[PDB]
Structure 1
Amino acid sequence: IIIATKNGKVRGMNLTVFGGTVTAFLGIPYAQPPLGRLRFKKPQSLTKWSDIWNATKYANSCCQNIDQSFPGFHGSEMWNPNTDLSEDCLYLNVWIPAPKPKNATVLIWIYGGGFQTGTSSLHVYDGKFLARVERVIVVSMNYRVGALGFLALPGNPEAPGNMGLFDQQLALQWVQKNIAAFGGNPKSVTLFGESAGAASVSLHLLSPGSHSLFTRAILQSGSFNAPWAVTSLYEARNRTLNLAKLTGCSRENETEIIKCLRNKDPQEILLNEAFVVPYGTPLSVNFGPTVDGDFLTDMPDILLELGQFKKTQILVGVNKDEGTAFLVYGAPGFSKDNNSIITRKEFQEGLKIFFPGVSEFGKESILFHYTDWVDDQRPENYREALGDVVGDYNFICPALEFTKKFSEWGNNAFFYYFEHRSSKLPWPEWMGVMHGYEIEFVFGLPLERRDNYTKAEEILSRSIVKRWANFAKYGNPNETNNSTSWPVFKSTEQKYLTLNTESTRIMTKLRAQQCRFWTSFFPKV
């Protein structure tokens, strides 16, 4: 079937999903290909095509380095791109219930990947189950990553920074001018994302240019106040100049540096992004969002303190073991192929890798705060402490803090704590409930019963799916009789809802004792 968009018509596909049908448009272009003289610039709006575009296959994924630490391993390769890499990559995808709705709420997914990786066409981001089961329209877009998306020379329209954020913004504009032709409501659109996708979503809360382009926001395992999320203009200029040296592109002038960089083979940009930082860590974001004076008119924390942001409802959460995924990408003694029992010395060496610039006194204080063992017998105490150090500092504690400050402006906020470990998880049991492994429950993958999930995992996925869709439609993540009511998160009581197969409780002040260190003592070492 065909739909006419404001720049031409596109042809879709019929998908048979759970005894019904979902109509899919995969690979709609939404911007001019950022090639040649457009490399490093903001995305240019598309002009009309006379033929009919066939949105029938997923499009090219944006240029990016590939995780090849574990050749053959599903737990790492499931995140790698599954279409061809190319600078020609500004495409989005649209999934629509059948029969065609007339004012369906739209959910727009922004993937993560540390701003360096990612693509909207991963299996775990398949929006067909969401459209089928809750009658929402699901949209996802490819946006530029690494230096091709976030190389910054502040002030210069040739390489201004945040280009990948503007990609996302141009996709949200596309939805405003086209989703009605598909049966969707441009006045009921909810952004959701994970990790850098979540951080991206929260930056759309701040940027005035994005204010009118969506309604509500969902932030899975990420926010802009996380330590990895924003590069200083200082650091970004140091890194741009380092990439210039590593590629042979050091000039005396900004515009000649980018003229030279625009002539490099993409793989000569890609394969040098790793060296622009002298002391990276497994959480390094070589090229990420900056204070560009355009997307971010100021520095996000001031915008958040002063209350200069879109006022709306938010849904925010974290997983139980955010930290463990990064331990096997650098920390000594850790492996996916053994139980990774480490000593206090190895723990001290892992703190070095994750906190390279921290004084010996500060690293001792991290150690001390995380070693008040409730059972000082357990060999795996140190292995768990290091994962909790990384997870609390990089994900959990910033998410709580963001929700506190955002709520204190008269906004309904809801917070969740995801504790279910997937029965299919390819990684070892010690990594627990990992970063990224709630996504397949949010997208409804366990509802497919020919897939080796458990029954409880189907029941859990179905409620998360329902609650997310309800928050999109109504602004409150409610479910149907025998269902826990989700209370608002408020600064004083700090109530959050737990998610797991056993019992979903309501709790207060998540990990408050851990996070007191990262907010109130660590900033002073």
Structure 2
Amino acid sequence: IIIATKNGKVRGMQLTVFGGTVTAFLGIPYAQPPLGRLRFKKPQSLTKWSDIWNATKYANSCCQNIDQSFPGFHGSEMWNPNTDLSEDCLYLNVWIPAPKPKNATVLIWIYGGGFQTGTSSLHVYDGKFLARVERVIVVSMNYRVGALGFLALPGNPEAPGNMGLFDQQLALQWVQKNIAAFGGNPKSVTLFGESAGAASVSLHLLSPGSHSLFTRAILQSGSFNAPWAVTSLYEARNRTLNLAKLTGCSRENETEIIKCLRNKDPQEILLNEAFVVPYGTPLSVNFGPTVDGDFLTDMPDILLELGQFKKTQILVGVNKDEGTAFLVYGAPGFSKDNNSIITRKEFQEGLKIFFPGVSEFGKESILFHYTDWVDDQRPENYREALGDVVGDYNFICPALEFTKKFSEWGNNAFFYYFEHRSSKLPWPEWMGVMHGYEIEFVFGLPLERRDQYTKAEEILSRSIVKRWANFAKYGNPQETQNQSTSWPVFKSTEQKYLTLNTESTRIMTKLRAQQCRFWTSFFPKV
């Protein structure tokens, strides 16, 4: 199957999925490769090609540091890139139903990874199941990460910041201009993403240049108001300047810094990214989104508070144990290979690691709020408190605040709490329902009966897949056929949310009420 796009013909490949067929176009270029003088710049448009472009394998992933903390361990290596790293990485993928659809709704996936890592070719982002089962079109793109995607000297077009977000935006433009040739409906495009991908989706809701490029949005475990998601212009300058010092590129002409950085091998830039922060946390967002005056016209908290965003429906949610994954990347006493019973002293040191530069009083206030136990003899008390501290502060309370503020301007919002721990999860049981492990259910991997998931997980994934697809198609994440719990709208008053689990799907209210009042209303003052 060959499709004529605006810039040339592309050839795809046929996939067998569940006794049917999906057509995949893997690795279509959507921008000029950002090499040489184009490194650190906004992505430039593609010029035509005259032959057929073979989109039959995933393209290069963008340059990035790799998680080496657990060599040989699937729980960490499943997130590492599975194609060659290259600056030549601005490519996207398209899965379409067979036979070709007539006007299919389009799902555009934006991966996470702290804005420092990630790739669209991971196994858990394979869009072929969604295309097969729901007859939607799935698109995913690679976008630049790390310093190469987010180095910033604001106002300087040699390195303006937010290049990785402009990569994503150019891919959204490509879908608007080209997806009807694949049978897609450019007027029915839903963005979905997880972690930094979800933060990205929320920033497209704020960016005037993305407003005409999509219809609706799904935010899995992230939002821009999360404390890790936006770099201040002061942090960003200190970090750009530190990178230049570390690479021998310090100059008084800021533009000459950039030209010096453009002569370094990518690996020299990657090696020094970790050190631009003096005292950072486990997996620090060294180079992330900034208020650049282009993609982001103002501090996003102000835009959110004053209703300056695309008015549409949103689907937002979080996992039960968002914080646990990060504990084994630096908190003392923690290990994926034992049950990580920690002491009060270790909990206090863990707060030092996750809240550097917070006052002694601020850290005491966290301890005060999280250590007033039901039973103080329970050995797991501090282990579980530290995970909840990290998950509530970094993910759950910001997602809930985002949903409240967004819905106050009149739109329908739906909030979920994912509490199922995958039967195959390679991480230990104390880590629970971790960050990132709803993704395989959203993409329908448990629908493949070969792949060792349980029957209950197939049913759960099937329901989630239908709810997500109904949200994208119709703005309403219901499963209408199988006597399912109806998913109520989230309103700032009642704050109803839907729990997702294999047993009983339930309507609850005011998730983490006490904890989020601490994080949202008190802790920003310290």
TM-score (norm. length: structure 1)? 1.00
Distance, in Å, in 1 between the alignment partners of 2:157 and 2:97 is 40
1:335-390 Cα offsets, whole Å, 9 max, x none, are 00100000000000000000111111111110011012122221001000000000
Post-superposition offset of 1:146: 0.1
Q: Is the 8 A contact 1:281 1:353 kept in 2?
A: yes
| 1:105 and 2:116 matched | no
Distance, in Å, in 1 between the alignment partners of 2:234 and 2:281 is 19
SS in 2 for 1:102: coil
SS in 1 for 2:379: coil
Distance, in Å, in 1 between the alignment partners of 2:80 and 2:186 is 32
Distance, in Å, in 1 between the alignment partners of 2:514 and 2:258 is 47
Post-superposition offset of 1:328: 0.2
TM-score (norm. length: structure 2)? 0.99
1:407-432 Cα offsets, whole Å, 9 max, x none, are 00000000000000000001000000
Post-superposition offset of 1:523: 1.7
Q: Is the 8 A contact 1:228 1:283 kept in 2?
A: no
Post-superposition offset of 1:317: 0.2
Post-superposition offset of 1:62: 0.2
Distance, in Å, in 1 between the alignment partners of 2:383 and 2:369 is 15
1:160-186 Cα offsets, whole Å, 9 max, x none, are 000000000000000000000000000
Post-superposition offset of 1:524: 2.1
Distance, in Å, in 2 between the alignment partners of 1:174 and 1:155 is 26
1:393-451 Cα offsets, whole Å, 9 max, x none, are 00000000000000000000000000000000010000000000000000000000011
Q: Number of paired residues?
A: 525
SS in 1 for 2:140: strand
SS in 2 for 1:218: strand
Structure 1 stretches of at least 4 aligned residues deviating more than 2 Å after TM superposition: none
Distance, in Å, in 1 between the alignment partners of 2:29 and 2:523 is 46
Q: Is the 8 A contact 1:151 1:159 kept in 2?
A: yes
1:486-506 Cα offsets, whole Å, 9 max, x none, are 000000000000000010000
SS in 2 for 1:23: strand
Distance, in Å, in 2 between the alignment partners of 1:475 and 1:125 is 22
Distance, in Å, in 2 between the alignment partners of 1:219 and 1:117 is 18
Query: Which deviates more from structure 2 when the two are superposed, residues 280-289 or residues 258-267?
Result: 280-289
* Match runs of 1:203-214 below 5 Å: 203-214=203-214
Post-superposition offset of 1:155: 0.5
Post-superposition offset of 1:256: 0.4
Distance, in Å, in 1 between the alignment partners of 2:427 and 2:444 is 21
Distance, in Å, in 2 between the alignment partners of 1:93 and 1:114 is 21
Distance, in Å, in 2 between the alignment partners of 1:304 and 1:316 is 15
1:464-498 Cα offsets, whole Å, 9 max, x none, are 00000000000000102410000000000000000
Distance, in Å, in 1 between the alignment partners of 2:200 and 2:307 is 18
Post-superposition offset of 1:283: 4.2
SS in 2 for 1:435: coil
Distance, in Å, in 2 between the alignment partners of 1:45 and 1:520 is 44
Distance, in Å, in 1 between the alignment partners of 2:323 and 2:71 is 22
SS in 2 for 1:140: strand
1:17-72 Cα offsets, whole Å, 9 max, x none, are 00000000000000000000000000000010001100000000000000011110
The corresponding residue for 1:146 is 146
Post-superposition offset of 1:114: 0.2
SS in 1 for 2:109: strand
Q: Is the 8 A contact 1:64 1:117 kept in 2?
A: yes
Q: Is the 8 A contact 1:153 1:240 kept in 2?
A: yes
Q: Is the 8 A contact 1:331 1:349 kept in 2?
A: yes
1:307-328 Cα offsets, whole Å, 9 max, x none, are 1110000000000000000000
Distance, in Å, in 2 between the alignment partners of 1:127 and 1:9 is 22
Distance, in Å, in 2 between the alignment partners of 1:519 and 1:36 is 44
Distance, in Å, in 1 between the alignment partners of 2:375 and 2:51 is 69
Distance, in Å, in 1 between the alignment partners of 2:519 and 2:469 is 33
Q: Is the 8 A contact 1:321 1:388 kept in 2?
A: yes
Post-superposition offset of 1:76: 0.4
Q: Is the 8 A contact 1:206 1:309 kept in 2?
A: yes
Query: Which deviates more from structure 2 when the two are superposed, residues 282-291 or residues 486-495?
Result: 282-291
Q: Is the 8 A contact 1:484 1:504 kept in 2?
A: yes
Post-superposition offset of 1:522: 1.1
In structure 2, stretches of 5+ residues that fail to align are none
The corresponding residue for 2:491 is 490
The corresponding residue for 2:130 is 130
Query: Which deviates more from structure 2 when the two are superposed, residues 17-26 or residues 353-362?
Result: 353-362
In structure 1, stretches of 5+ residues that fail to align are none
Distance, in Å, in 1 between the alignment partners of 2:301 and 2:234 is 17
Post-superposition offset of 1:287: 0.1
Distance, in Å, in 1 between the alignment partners of 2:358 and 2:10 is 54
Distance, in Å, in 2 between the alignment partners of 1:184 and 1:479 is 23
1:82-105 Cα offsets, whole Å, 9 max, x none, are 000000000000000011101000
Distance, in Å, in 2 between the alignment partners of 1:229 and 1:256 is 29
Distance, in Å, in 1 between the alignment partners of 2:374 and 2:505 is 25
SS in 1 for 2:189: strand
The corresponding residue for 1:278 is 278
1:106-163 Cα offsets, whole Å, 9 max, x none, are 0000000000000000000000000000000000000000000000010011100000
SS in 2 for 1:416: strand
Query: Which deviates more from structure 2 when the two are superposed, residues 267-276 or residues 364-373?
Result: 364-373
1:188-234 Cα offsets, whole Å, 9 max, x none, are 00000000000000000000000000000000000000000000111
Distance, in Å, in 1 between the alignment partners of 2:217 and 2:201 is 7
Distance, in Å, in 2 between the alignment partners of 1:469 and 1:375 is 44
Query: Which deviates more from structure 2 when the two are superposed, residues 282-291 or residues 490-499?
Result: 282-291
Post-superposition offset of 1:9: 0.2
